[PDB]
Amino acid sequence: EVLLNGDINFKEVRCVGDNGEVYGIISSKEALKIAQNLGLDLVLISASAKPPVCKVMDYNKFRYQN
């Protein structure tokens, strides 16, 4: 239901961490590189938002929040 990791393809995303960390507006490729280097997932929160909002977080935690 939720797009993750390599399935998130946008030229620009607003990338936020799980405790208020600001990464700014970066490519989905850059956001994925940050998530991978931090041992985390990239989770698409909103594609409707412009630019789309992604979080760098543990997907297992996202899944259980919902």
Curated annotation (Swiss-Prot):
Coiled coil: none annotated. It is found in: Cytoplasm. Signal peptide: none annotated. Belongs to the IF-3 family. IF-3 binds to the 30S ribosomal subunit and shifts the equilibrium between 70S ribosomes and their 50S and 30S subunits in favor of the free subunits, thus enhancing the availability of 30S subunits on which protein synthesis initiation begins. Monomer. This is Translation initiation factor IF-3. It comes from Helicobacter pylori (strain J99 / ATCC 700824) (Campylobacter pylori J99). The gene is infC.
